[PDB]
Amino acid sequence: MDLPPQLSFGLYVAAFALGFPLNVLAIRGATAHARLRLTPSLVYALNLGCSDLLLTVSLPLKAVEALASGAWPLPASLCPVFAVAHFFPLYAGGGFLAALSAGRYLGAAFPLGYQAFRRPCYSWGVCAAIWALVLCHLGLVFGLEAPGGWLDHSNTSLGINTPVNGSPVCLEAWDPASAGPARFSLSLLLFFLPLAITAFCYVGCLRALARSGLTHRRKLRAAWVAGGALLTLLLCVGPYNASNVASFLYPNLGGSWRKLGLITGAWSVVLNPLVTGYL
Amino acid sequence: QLKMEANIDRIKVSKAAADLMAYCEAHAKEDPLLTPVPASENPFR
Amino acid sequence: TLSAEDKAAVERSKMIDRNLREDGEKAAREVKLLLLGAGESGKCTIVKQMKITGIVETHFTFKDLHFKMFDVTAQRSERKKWIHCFEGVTAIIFCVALSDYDLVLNRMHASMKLFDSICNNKWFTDTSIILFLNKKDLFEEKIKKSPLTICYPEYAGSNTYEEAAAYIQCQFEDLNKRKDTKEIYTHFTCSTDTKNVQFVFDAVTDVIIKNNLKDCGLF
Amino acid sequence: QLKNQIRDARKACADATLSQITNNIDPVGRIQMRTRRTLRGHLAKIYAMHWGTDSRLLVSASQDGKLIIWDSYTTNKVHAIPLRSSWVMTCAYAPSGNYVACGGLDNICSIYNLKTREGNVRVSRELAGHTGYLSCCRFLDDNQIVTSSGDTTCALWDIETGQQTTTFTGHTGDVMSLSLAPDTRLFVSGACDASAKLWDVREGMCRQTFTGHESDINAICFFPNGNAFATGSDDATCRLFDLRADQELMTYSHDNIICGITSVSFSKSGRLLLAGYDDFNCNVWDALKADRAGVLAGHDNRVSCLGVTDDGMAVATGSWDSFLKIWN
Numbered sequence: 075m076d077l078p079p080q081l082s083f084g085l086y087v088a089a090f091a092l093g094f095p096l097n098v099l100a101i102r103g104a105t106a107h108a109r110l111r112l113t114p115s116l117v118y119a120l121n122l123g124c125s126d127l128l129l130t131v132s133l134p135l136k137a138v139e140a141l142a143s144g145a146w147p148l149p150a151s152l153c154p155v156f157a158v159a160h161f162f163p164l165y166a167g168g169g170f171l172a173a174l175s176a177g178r179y180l181g182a183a184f185p186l187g188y189q190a191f192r193r194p195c196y197s198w199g200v201c202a203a204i205w206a207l208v209l210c211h212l213g214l215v216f217g218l219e220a221p222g223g224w225l226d227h228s229n230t231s232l233g234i235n236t237p238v239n240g241s242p243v244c245l246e247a248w249d250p251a252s253a254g255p256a257r258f259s260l261s262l263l264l265f266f267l268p269l270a271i272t273a274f275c276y277v278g279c280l281r282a283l284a285r286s287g288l289t290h291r292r293k294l295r296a297a298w299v300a301g302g303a304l305l306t307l308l309l310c311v312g313p314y315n316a317s318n319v320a321s322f323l324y325p326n327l328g329g330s331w332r333k334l335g336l337i338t339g340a341w342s343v344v345l346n347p348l349v350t351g352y353l
Numbered sequence: 354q355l356k357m358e359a360n361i362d363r364i365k366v367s368k369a370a371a372d373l374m375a376y377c378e379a380h381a382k383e384d385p386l387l388t389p390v391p392a393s394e395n396p397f398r
Numbered sequence: 399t400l401s402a403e404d405k406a407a408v409e410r411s412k413m414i415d416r417n418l419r420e421d422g423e424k425a426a427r428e429v430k431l432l433l434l435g436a437g438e439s440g441k442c443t444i445v446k447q448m449k450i451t452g453i454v455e456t457h458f459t460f461k462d463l464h465f466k467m468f469d470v471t472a473q474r475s476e477r478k479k480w481i482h483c484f485e486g487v488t489a490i491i492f493c494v495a496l497s498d499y500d501l502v503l504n505r506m507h508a509s510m511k512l513f514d515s516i517c518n519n520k521w522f523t524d525t526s527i528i529l530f531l532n533k534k535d536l537f538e539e540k541i542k543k544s545p546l547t548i549c550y551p552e553y554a555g556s557n558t559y560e561e562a563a564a565y566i567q568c569q570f571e572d573l574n575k576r577k578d579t580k581e582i583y584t585h586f587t588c589s590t591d592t593k594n595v596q597f598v599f600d601a602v603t604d605v606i607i608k609n610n611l612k613d614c615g616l617f
Numbered sequence: 618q619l620k621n622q623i624r625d626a627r628k629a630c631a632d633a634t635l636s637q638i639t640n641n642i643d644p645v646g647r648i649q650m651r652t653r654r655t656l657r658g659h660l661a662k663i664y665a666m667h668w669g670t671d672s673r674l675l676v677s678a679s680q681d682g683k684l685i686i687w688d689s690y691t692t693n694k695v696h697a698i699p700l701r702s703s704w705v706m707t708c709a710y711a712p713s714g715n716y717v718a719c720g721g722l723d724n725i726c727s728i729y730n731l732k733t734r735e736g737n738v739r740v741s742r743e744l745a746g747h748t749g750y751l752s753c754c755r756f757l758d759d760n761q762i763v764t765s766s767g768d769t770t771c772a773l774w775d776i777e778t779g780q781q782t783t784t785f786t787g788h789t790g791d792v793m794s795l796s797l798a799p800d801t802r803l804f805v806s807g808a809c810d811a812s813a814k815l816w817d818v819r820e821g822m823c824r825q826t827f828t829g830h831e832s833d834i835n836a837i838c839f840f841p842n843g844n845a846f847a848t849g850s851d852d853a854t855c856r857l858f859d860l861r862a863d864q865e866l867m868t869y870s871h872d873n874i875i876c877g878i879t880s881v882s883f884s885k886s887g888r889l890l891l892a893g894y895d896d897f898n899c900n901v902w903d904a905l906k907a908d909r910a911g912v913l914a915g916h917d918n919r920v921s922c923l924g925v926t927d928d929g930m931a932v933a934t935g936s937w938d939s940f941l942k943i944w945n
């Protein structure tokens with residue numbers, strides 16, 4: 075039971091029109107907070123805001139392609155650019171959330187050491203490392219798997235694969251059992267390990283707070299904030315990776331599952347600032 | 354001390370106000386705040 | 399900066415700025431505590447235990463952590479004029495003489511009034527406060543000898559040490575209106591040296607954890 | 618009896634108000650000031666500042682434990698004296714520029730010699746003898762300094778002798794601020810008893826006392842003429858007192874302002890006065906019409922102090938944040 079194209083287009087437009095003002099307001103608030111004083115959490119907030127803005131910029135092409143006659147209503151020259159702009163933020167947000175959870179765990183379980191090592195330079199360096207690693211992984215996978223690479227067929231187009239007729243969007247009509255292991259490895263290394271790190275840091279912070287003698291209200295507020303962030307990350311990223319691993323396990327997957335996964339991933343840009351916007 | 358404070362010479366308030374007004378108007382030109390200063394020779398700009 | 403004098407001035411300014419940055423980095427991780435008391439409690443017994451004008455400065459390091467304690471017993475002036483200077487301190491150490499309830503300057507009432515005044519200050523809302531009750535043995539001897547009803551006519555019950563100490567602690571703790579964002583670490587002073595410094599270190603660690611959580615955004 | 622006679626004499630001398638005399642004056646237009654220079658060397662809240670004689674170098678003392686002399690023309694720093702006590706609330710600059718004094722919770726007005734043979738700043742004297750928090754230190758000459766403490770008294774010290782020579786007593790409340798006349802022969806002190814007393818440098822007794830404030834006085838400053846001064850209290854008002862008239866001339870207050878006043882200073886000609894406020898705002902009042910002329914909202918936390926240069930080229934306002942602004 076695939077969703078009608080009109081409903082998909084409408085929900086994409088609504089999601090973009092709600093996310094964009096919230097995203098720009100969150101970015102403005104983060105910049106205003108950083109102007110007075112710079113904090114390690116503010117760096118992650120600014121990075122998340124930039125990723126959300128990039129995702130909103132990439133949204134309209136997907137929104138207009140979601141129609142029935144929307145196989146590829148755009149030039150193919152910038153198709154890899156759109157694919158990167160749509161794929162990078164999904165893992166970038168998870169990486170930023172994992173880094174923030176690690177920082178919170180370090181500041182809670184090891185307060186003296188964290189205070190002695192309070193340096194925004196370390197946060198900027200780790201953010202740059204995450205950006206570089208994700209970009210390098212995406213580029214290597216695009217070269218190895220997508221057509222036009224060294225291991226790809228010579229008689230092919232970069233991001234275009236229409237063996238029958240027409241012209242589809244990048245990764246919209248990917249050939250089954252072609253980049254299955256590559257997509258599975260990307261999903262693992264970009265979400266499952268960050269998810270495990272985030273869960274470990276969350277449970278460690280909760281244990282440290284329980285062992286702490288702080289006020290019950292402060293502990294409850296911190297636990298609620300951490301749980302809300304974890305629930306946001308789950309409900310925004312997990313379904314897409316689950317669909318990817320289900321497709322990798324056996325090629326029987328096909329139909330509206332990919333559309334639902336993409337819609338859930340697009341809901342991230344509109345749902346994340348609600349719990350982490352620093353308004 | 355209060356007796357010494359009481360035995361002092363006091364002048365009219367109007368004369369003192371007139372003197373203060375004359376002092377304020379005499380140095381109005383010399384004050385760089387009442388009259389804006391050009392940036393050509395301003396040390397701070 | 400064509401002139402040599404201008405270059406020298408710029409270099410001196412850069413050196414001064416780097417020295418300021420180094421000093422700020424050094425002082426960022428340094429922990430300061432404030433010592434307060436009413437009447438004879440201004441001269442706290444912690445410094446005397448360690449041994450055996452204006453602000454008195456004391457330095458001691460526990461568990462590789464530097465602690466600074468300031469004594470304000472010599473500042474016999476208006477408290478509100480200079481109370482805003484002691485802002486951003488890690489914690490405030492309050493010492494109450496439990497054996498001063500019988501003595502009249504009334505001493506316990508004055509201590510409670512001063513505690514209420516300092517706890518309700520607009521500049522001390524974020525700062526945590528540590529409550530120390532001294533002379534527990536003297537207090538128990540006094541209540542065994544003299545009745546406690548004189549100090550608290552409303553209070554009724556037996557004259558044992560445990561319930562009297564609990565009642566005093568509750569009456570001291572319930573003196574703050576903001577019970578959500580303010581925490582009080584009440585304690586009883588004992589002859590053991592390790593217990594007091596351990597409690598102070600635990601309170602400082604809790605304050606540091608709260609500050610780190612606030613910085614990370616969990617507040 | 619004597620107080621009643623003094624009040625009757627004050628009432629009789631009040632022939633007319635200052636507003637009636639200044640009615641014919643054309644009102645001054647609105648003035649806009651911009652922060653020409655910003656100083657960010659400090660890493661903690663500052664409490665006092667004082668300009669130099671040449672109107673180029675100024676000294677500011679902050680709570681981190683040291684004071685920095687700033688060259689406002691170039692914004693670079695020229696000196697940095699690490700104070701022994703981190704609790705400092707006052708600072709002073711010598712008229713000759715050689716010496717710098719500071720004081721705080723510790724009852725010491727430490728004096729440092731900027732000019733030394735070895736080229737390194739060193740402590741020249743360490744004055745002691747006060748029993749209260751040192752509210753303000755001010756230099757009379759190269760060898761005379763006047764300090765006001767929290768013991769409801771003021772004293773005159775000698776740098777070479779190291780001991781106070783003349784002491785001033787009579788204030789009911791703690792003295793908070795003081796200002797020096799241009800001829801350095803007489804001065805006032807603003808205590809917490811809502812009163813200001815006029816003292817003598819030479820013989821040292823209070824000729825006249827001024828009352829009328831509803832709260833403790835935090836700031837005080839003489840008129841450029843030297844025959845009048847303005848006071849700033851915690852009840853959000855500024856009163857211009859006249860030495861000859863021995864009574865309040867004009868009051869500067871408004872319904873909008875309810876916050877206290879930290880620092881008060883006059884301009885070069887005395888036409889306009891700048892007063893700090895607890896809402897990180899500076900109001901440029903009119904000394905003759907009690908009308909606001911401008912608002913300096915360039916600060917963040919609270920305007921701790923502000924001062925005007927001798928030539929009146931620019932005004933510098935300190936504040937509890939690490940940034941210092943120069944307004945011109």
Ligand SMILES: CC/C=C\C/C=C/C/C=C\C/C=C\C/C=C/C/C=C\CCC(=O)O
Nearest residue numbers: 114169172173174176177197200204264268
């Ligand atoms: C694709 C991204 C996947 C993982 C990304 C980064 C991950 C894990 C980082 C750290 C956790 C455990 C240990 C190393 C210690 C690290 C310092 C990192 C952060 C804290 C900085 C701060 O918030 O102040």
